[PDB]
Paper text:
Bromo and extra-terminal (BET) proteins provide a recruitment platform initiated by the recognition of acetylated lysines (Kac) by their tandem bromodomains (BRD, Dhalluin et al., 1999, Jacobson et al., 2000, Owen et al., 2000). BETs, like all of the 42 human BRD-containing proteins, contain additional interaction domains that recruit other proteins to the acetylated protein target, forming complex assemblies and contributing to processes such as chromatin remodeling and transcription. Direct targeting of BET-BRDs by small-molecule inhibitors such as the high-affinity and pan-BET specificity thienodiazepine (+)-JQ1 (hereafter referred to as JQ1) enables their displacement from Kac. Multiple decreased interactors harbor sequences that can directly associate with BET-BRDs in canonical or new BRD-mediated structural binding modes, and we propose that the tandem BRDs present in each BET protein may be capable of simultaneously recruiting both a histone and a second interactor.
By contrast, tyrosine was clearly enriched at the +1 position for several regulated preys, including histone H1 and BAZ1B, and peptide SPOT arrays confirmed binding of BRD4 to these sites. We crystallized a K221ac BAZ1B peptide with BRD4/BD1 and observed typical Kac-engagement by N140 in the high-resolution structure, while the adjacent tyrosine (BAZ1B Y222) also inserted into the binding cavity, linking to K221ac via a water-mediated bridge. Although K221ac superimposed well with K5ac in the H4 K5ac/K8ac complex with BRD4/BD1, the peptide backbone followed a different path, which induced structural changes on the surface of the BRD4/BD1 module via side-chain re-alignment of D144, I146, and L148, while inserting BAZ1B Y222 in the same space as H4 K8ac. Taken together, our data suggest that Kac-Y motifs can compensate for the absence of a second Kac, resulting in a similar structural template that fits within the volume of BET BRD sites. Phosphorylation on the longer linker on histone H3 (Kac-X4-Kac; the second Kac being outside of the BRD) affects BET binding, potentially linking cellular signaling events to epigenetic circuits. Together with the discovery of binding to a new Kac-Y motif (>16,000 KY motifs are encoded in the human proteome), we suggest that the BET BRDs can contact a larger target space than previously appreciated.
Residue numbers in the entry:
A (entry chain A): 43 to 168
B (entry chain B): 217 to 224
């Protein structure tokens, strides 16, 4: 079985809209989301459908861009670092689970390169 | 190359 997905709503959690978080949605997430290699990363890994009974034994902090997108749209984060951490967790999970050079890793590498290029222009917090 | 993840 699949675990519940990561939390995207929590009324009592402290949260903000900041200019940096706005950039993370409008530039960073949008750029990665539209890419031809986004699809494995647009939703939680479905370990049931893919018959990957070890995935959620190995990966204990799952993360995906569908979750990130929801968190950004809901203004769920407190700060940009929290969101950047989610992207990095997503990439790192991929590299932990998949084999170096395999198609999924290649896809993650392409997205991560773009991520790094866009986060270069993260604005100073207003 | 062909990835194990999708080798259902």
């Amino acid at each position: 079985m699949n675990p519940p997905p990561p939390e995207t709503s929590n009324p009592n959690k402290p949260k903000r809209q900041t200019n940096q978080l706005q950039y993370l949605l409008r530039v960073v997430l949008k750029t990665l989301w539209k890419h031809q290699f986004a699809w494995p990363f647009q939703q939680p890994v479905d370990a049931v459908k893919l018959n990957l009974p070890d995935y959620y034994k190995i990966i204990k902090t799952p993360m995906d861009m569908g979750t990130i997108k929801k968190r950004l749209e809901n203004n769920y984060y407190w700060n940009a670092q929290e969101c950047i951490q989610d992207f990095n967790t997503m990439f790192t999970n991929c590299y932990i689970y998949n084999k170096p050079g395999d198609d999924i890793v290649l896809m993650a590498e392409a997205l991560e390169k773009l991520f790094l290029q866009k986060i270069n222009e993260l604005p100073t917090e207003e | 190359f062909l990835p194990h993840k999708y080798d259902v």
